[PDB]
Write a protein that binds this DNA or RNA. Structure first.
Ligand SMILES: [Mg+2]
Ligand SMILES: [Mg+2]
Ligand SMILES: [Zn+2]
Ligand SMILES: [Zn+2]
Lengths: 589, 589
DNA sequence: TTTTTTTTTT
């Protein structure tokens, strides 16, 4: 009614950034350079420019937003006429709204308003095409005319074809012409409330969201996203009666963000510390007294070695950890911590997981009737960490399903007429108890660990945690009580920035192995194998996998400090933690 | 015959509460401040002010309620004109009326009248939106005018669109405009009759209830509620012919209360008793001769310690109790009691429960065809108590499914392509028999208890109940016979108010640990660990869990006395019952 | 036919 297009262009051209940079003229120019079709504007900036326009953007979104998009398209097309004939429509995507609604707490009064929802994305569909401007043909030996049907408008959520020909005025048959039809990319996804938000004793709620055009395929299942958009009622057949006055809610999304500049500077400044490795290790599960070898090993597992992908084969880069320990030894608490700190992790329990749930499930969809594949835990954990607590509670017949994923990092299935293989490039961090609950030193290591060697060799480090009371006891109790009282530790790396640091290291640091490090690894591996032949009753074998583990561990020691080369220091650190592991499983060098 | 709006406004503004407080203008102020759209009035106050108004409220509800709501809306908007343009309708929810029909016993003549139903809420749907005034648009190259269709009325339970356009007079197709459409929150729930109401040998009946607007999400599954409302007939498709002359009954809810003020003074005055802990303990299972240590343990488990939720981890606050005893030692009876007295509790049997039924089940809902998550017992008991009777009757391979819930207080599953973890912050109180039905004193404690160390360490206190005949026998018999005769115990706390006291204490009392109590706990814990290192054969270990249990128990003794600090007395009481526990399983100190 | 589940059943 009162047009804001000039207001919007003045906002774009003149809104000064932080250093008088013209934040949005820079974003516009960069958009045109890379030919991206979507301009993101912060809502706080709009409220800082024109309060009235910001109100219209939130409350009258459906119609004020395309007008702004048209003004932006015109301005862009003046800036560079070559945008025409490449992109016909741009988007004005509003990000960072003031108030976020908790998914469960939306009510009637939130429909039609532009709102934000924070939640975990659990499911997406393939990419489809939605018609927004149809072109029909009246089949009749008189008309035979093509016409755009959603005239002066746009095709609604429901699909409706005309009943009266607007080109002649005579009813009849209408055939859809796909040649002269205009479509937009379309994807349905489901987001559910953050686990910390689910009320006591209830199950998490879900909400269906719709992503169109360049929003399609912008996040993977498991990603915690912050969607901005508009709510509406889900119509499956509303033109017919017979009760059913009730509807579901969905969000048409205009903006989405997952999980970023000062963070890089901070992680770099952190890694200038000559003792940064010790810092990270002491930052691992800080409310747990002791278990430094385990904190080190878990930190290594967080960082991981370097995967080698070649012309014929590929070689695993991820580090697997196994902690077999007495009851009450902070195992599950540490595993909970690393699932929290890791940039991408999945938490599973040996008794809570199936063979199919951990790898891939073949589910018979009761709709079409046909069989389809669903990603299990190790596949969703691709690119991250999968934690298997209480791994001795898995059925062995179920547990062997992860052997392929642990070494070749693929889950390959051939079932119900479908043959496929998925990537399960996930690092396994596992914990369990010995055969008799606690470790029994009176018995050989073999019948006490009670795991096959085929899976033991898959583990780079295997520590046996014995809970033996000694002089440590008093210290322990004091530490625990200080934890209960609320006395947190100082000079630590907070879990969020530790996560950001791990993510950066994994994304950007690929350490190369130096010759001196390679010589130390070979020499220690030979010594390892010679000592291993001395006790063949041990179910802990020394295989080429252990040489690869020395590689991966030294690579991760380098990675942890952000180093681009694996120097002698990192090789020695690897040999030493390896030697600790071997001492615990009863192997003296 | 009398304009009841003036009477109602007089009731609100001038009704003196208990201490001449003007109860309802104060409730109006709180409602207007927090911008809530619903004012609760007790029916007894209305009957105490104006019998004729109360009679009109219950008997002539259908028309009297909107008039009163309009009067209240006018008054509210006079209090704060900013209420305008935020909320157009207020709610007058009358609570506690004396027209309470038992669920099974409703009949025809009770339809249309305002009645109350006391029952357990078992199932709810997600929160949906029911249209209550649609706005259509006539699609035709001549009309194209917008109009609200349910004109001069409101959309009925069935959804009906017009057949004739009122803006032109021409029939055709009508498009729903969700923008100009009016919606109300909608939620279907199921309530079933109280177990004391279920006829002999039959199954409990159920009834469908509908909660709209702010009534939505006002109770969780498991809650015993008292729903007030009006009954009506269920319509799934009634406008078309073809048989189906029979209808189901449901309640449109207007008011609901779960499970409330002077009780605070009652429990506070109770807590001034210098021996209040002994009173509570003697109020536990009053019909059972002896077993006072178990009664104490159950009282502690009812109260529970303080959970610590920190930056990285969280630390369990609930107290787990295990009673392993000879047959016929009043175990099941005491457990039944604590399930009755606990403000929220779940009762299960080792042979009656699954590993999936106790934690969480992956159910293939045959409607959507896809796999769905269902809360098991330990998840439903979040924030309360779950009692596992006959726990020795579980398969061990099934029982380990609760280990995670017992320590980390989450049930996490990964199956059929879905990964989730729910909160299971419930205290487990379990009982079972020894390996040989009765305890065998000629055989070691290890194979007599017949439980893994991994589950035993999860239990803060484990009592071995032997039924050995001595001088106790005659006293026992006399107590039993008096119980049969109907001679109840004096100087007792009735179960209903003891439940209320427990509720208040758990909700509001967070005991802090003093330095002296912490030092006492540390010393005793070190003594425990040395004494345990003396006995390496037992299945009862001493792990960090036992130190955490001393923390929880002393915290709970303070909580039981409503103390805000953990004094030396509470630490000493905790240490002594721990010492008793250790004596029963066989450790002298 | 696969999968989780409770159940009767090859
Ligand atoms: Mg554990
Ligand atoms: Mg029994
Ligand atoms: Zn025509
Ligand atoms: Zn019309």
């Amino acid at each position: 009614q009162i047009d804001y297009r000039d207001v919007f262009i003045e906002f774009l051209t003149t809104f000064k950034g932080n250093n008088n940079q013209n934040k949005y003229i820079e974003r516009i120019n960069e958009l045109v350079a890379y030919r991206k079709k979507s301009l993101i504007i912060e809502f706080s900036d709009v409220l800082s420019f024109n309060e009235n326009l910001a109100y219209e953007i939130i409350n009258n979104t459906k119609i004020i937003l395309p007008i702004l998009e048209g003004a932006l398209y015109d301005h862009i097309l003046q800036l560079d006429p070559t945008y025409q004939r490449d992109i016909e429509k741009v988007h004005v995507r509003i990000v960072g709204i003031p108030r976020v609604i908790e998914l469960r707490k939306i009510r009637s009064t939130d429909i039609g308003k532009l709102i934000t929802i924070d939640g975990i994305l659990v499911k997406v569909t393939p990419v489809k095409e939605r018609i927004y401007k149809a072109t029909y043909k009246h089949i009749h030996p008189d008309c035979m005319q093509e016409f755009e049907w959603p005239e002066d408008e746009e095709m609604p959520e429901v699909l409706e074809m005309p009943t009266i020909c607007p080109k002649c005025g005579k009813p009849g048959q209408f055939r859809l012409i796909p040649e002269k039809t205009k479509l937009i990319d379309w994807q349905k996804a489901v987001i559910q409330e953050r686990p910390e938000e689910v009320p006591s004793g209830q199950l998490p709620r879900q909400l269906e969201i719709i992503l169109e055009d360049d929003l399609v395929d912008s996040a993977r299942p498991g990603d915690r996203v912050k969607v901005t958009g508009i709510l509406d009622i889900k119509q499956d057949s509303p033109v017919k009666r017979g009760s059913r006055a009730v509807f579901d809610i969905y969000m048409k999304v205009s903006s989405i963000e997952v999980s970023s500049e000062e963070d890089e500077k901070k992680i770099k400044d952190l890694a200038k510390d000559p003792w940064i490795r010790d810092r990270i290790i002491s930052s691992i599960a800080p409310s747990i007294y002791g278990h430094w070898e385990l904190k080190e090993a878990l930190a290594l597992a967080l960082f991981g070695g370097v995967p080698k992908v070649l012309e014929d084969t590929r070689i695993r880069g991820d580090i697997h950890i196994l902690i077999i320990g007495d009851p009450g030894t902070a195992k599950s608490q540490m595993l909970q911590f690393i699932s929290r700190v890791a940039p991408r992790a999945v938490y599973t329990t040996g008794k809570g997981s199936t063979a199919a749930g951990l790898t891939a499930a073949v589910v018979r969809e009761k709709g079409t009737g046909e069989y389809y594949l669903e990603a299990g835990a190790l596949v969703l954990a691709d690119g991250g960490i999968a934690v298997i607590d209480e791994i001795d509670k898995m059925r062995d017949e179920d547990r062997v399903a992860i052997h392929e994923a642990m070494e070749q990092q693929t889950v390959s299935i051939a079932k119900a007429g479908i043959v496929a293989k998925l990537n399960a490039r996930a690092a396994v961090i596992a914990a369990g108890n010995p055969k008799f609950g606690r470790y029994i030193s009176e018995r050989p290591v073999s019948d006490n660990i009670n795991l096959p060697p085929t899976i033991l060799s898959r583990f780079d480090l295997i520590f046996i945690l014995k809970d033996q009371p000694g002089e440590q006891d008093r210290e322990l109790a004091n530490y625990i009580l200080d934890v209960h009282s609320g006395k947190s530790t100082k000079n630590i790396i907070d879990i969020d920035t530790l996560r950001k640091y791990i993510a950066y290291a994994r994304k950007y640091v690929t350490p190369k192995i130096t010759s001196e490090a390679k010589n130390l690894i070979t020499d220690f591996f030979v010594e390892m194998r010679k000592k291993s032949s001395e006790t063949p009753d041990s179910p802990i074998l020394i295989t080429p996998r252990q040489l690869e583990a020395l590689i991966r561990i030294s690579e991760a020691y380098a990675k942890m400090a952000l180093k681009a080369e694996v120097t002698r220091e990192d090789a020695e650190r690897a040999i030493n933690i390896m030697r600790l592991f071997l001492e615990s499983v009863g192997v003296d060098m």
